[PDB]
Amino acid sequence: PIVSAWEKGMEAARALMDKYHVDNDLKANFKLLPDQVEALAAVCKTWLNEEHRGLQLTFTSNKTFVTMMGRFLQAYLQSFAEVTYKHHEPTGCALWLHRCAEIEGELKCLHGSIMINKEHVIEQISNTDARCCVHDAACPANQFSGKSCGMFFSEGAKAQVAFKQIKAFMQALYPNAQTGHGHLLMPLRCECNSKPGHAPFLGRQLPKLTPFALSNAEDLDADLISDKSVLASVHHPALIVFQCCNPVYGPNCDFKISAPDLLNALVMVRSLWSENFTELPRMVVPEFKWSTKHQYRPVSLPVAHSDARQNPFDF
Ligand SMILES: [Zn+2]
Numbered sequence: 001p002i003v004s005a006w007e008k009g010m011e012a013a014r015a016l017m018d019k020y021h022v023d024n025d026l027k028a029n030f031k032l033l034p035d036q037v038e039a040l041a042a043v044c045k046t047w048l049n050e051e052h053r054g055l056q057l058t059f060t061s062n063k064t065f066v067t068m069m070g071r072f073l074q075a076y077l078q079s080f081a082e083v084t085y086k087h088h089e090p091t092g093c094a095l096w097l098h099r100c101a102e103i104e105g106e107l108k109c110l111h112g113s114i115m116i117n118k119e120h121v122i123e124q125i126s127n128t129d130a131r132c133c134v135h136d137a138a139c140p141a142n143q144f145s146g147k148s149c150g151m152f153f154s155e156g157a158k159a160q161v162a163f164k165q166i167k168a169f170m171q172a173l174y175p176n177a178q179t180g181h182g183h184l185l186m187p188l189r190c191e192c193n194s195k196p197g198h199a200p201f202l203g204r205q206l207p208k209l210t211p212f213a214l215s216n217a218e219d220l221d222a223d224l225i226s227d228k229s230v231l232a233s234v235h236h237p238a239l240i241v242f243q244c245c246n247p248v249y250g251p252n253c254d255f256k257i258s259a260p261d262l263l264n265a266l267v268m269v270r271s272l273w274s275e276n277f278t279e280l281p282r283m284v285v286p287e288f289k290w291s292t293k294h295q296y297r298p299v300s301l302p303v304a305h306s307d308a309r310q311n312p313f314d315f
C-alpha cells in the first residue's frame with residue numbers, strides 16, 4: 001500500500017479542493033478529521049455555483065443543503081481511501097423503513113409501532129387528528145415521556161401526505177429500484193449533536209420531523225407536468241422537513257432541510273464525484289434501529305398552582 005489510507009484520502013481531498021478553488025486556510029488546515037466538514041462543503045458550494053446556479057430548494061436553508069453535501073462528500077472520501085473513524089459515521093444520517101405510507105390514515109413512529117390518536121388544541125385551534133408515540137399515550141398532546149422517540153404530529157393526515165410525497169419522489173428517481181422505496185433518508189444529527197462527545201442536552205435527541213404544506217401546489221395544473229418528481233408533490237402536496245432536535249418557537253440551531261432536498265444532496269454529490277473519479281465507492285448510510293440512546297429526555301417539573309390563601313391548610 002503505496003501511501004497510507006489517510007494519505008490516500010488526503011490526496012483525493014486536496015485534488016478536489018484545488019480543482020474547486022477553496023480558501024487557502026481551509027486547504028492548509030484540512031487533515032481529513034471527522035469534524036472537518038467545512039472545506040468539503042466549500043468544494044460542494046463551488047460546484048453548485050458553477051453547475052447548478054438556479055437550484056430551487058424547498059423548506060431548506062442554503063447552509064444546511066451545502067453542509068449535507070459536505071457530509072455525503074466526506075463519506076465518499078472516507079470510503080474511497082478506506083479510512084473510518086469509529087463513533088463518527090460521516091453522513092450523520094440513517095435509513096428509516098418508516099411504514100408510514102402503507103396503510104391509509106396510519107402512521108408509525110421511530111419505534112416502528114403505530115401512533116395513537118390524540119386531540120391537540122392550540123391557542124384557539126382544535127386538531128382532532130393528532131398522533132403521538134404510543135409511549136406518550138397518557139401525556140398531554142406534544143409532551144413527551146422518558147420512553148418517547150420524540151415524534152408527534154399535530155395533523156396525522158398531513159403527515160401521511162408528506163410520507164406519500166417522499167415515497168413517490170423516490171419511485172420517480174429510482175423507477176427500477178429493487179430496494180429502498182420504503183426507506184426514509186433522515187438526519188440523526190443537527191449542529192447541536194454533530195459531535196459524539198457534544199455536551200448532553202434535554203428534549204428530543206434527533207432532528208425534529210415535521211410535515212409542511214405546499215399550499216400553492218394545488219393552485220397548479222397537473223396536465224402540463226411530465227416530470228414524475230414534480231408530480232410526487234402535486235399528488236402529495238406536503239414535505240417532510242427536518243429541523244434542529246429542539247427547534248425554537250438548552251442548545252438550538254438553524255438546521256433545516258426537506259426530505260427531497262436531503263436526498264438531492266446525496267444524488268448531487270454522486271454527480272460531483274463522477275466528474276472527478278471513475279468509480280463511485282460503496283457508501284452505506286446505516287439502517288435506522290430504534291435504541292434507548294435516542295429517547296427523549298424530558299424534564300417534568302411540578303409548578304405550583306396559585307392559591308389566594310395565605311396558609312395551606314385549615315387546622
Ligand atoms: Zn415512538
Ligand SMILES: [Zn+2]
Pocket residue numbers: 190191192193243244245246251252253254255
Ligand atoms: Zn440543533
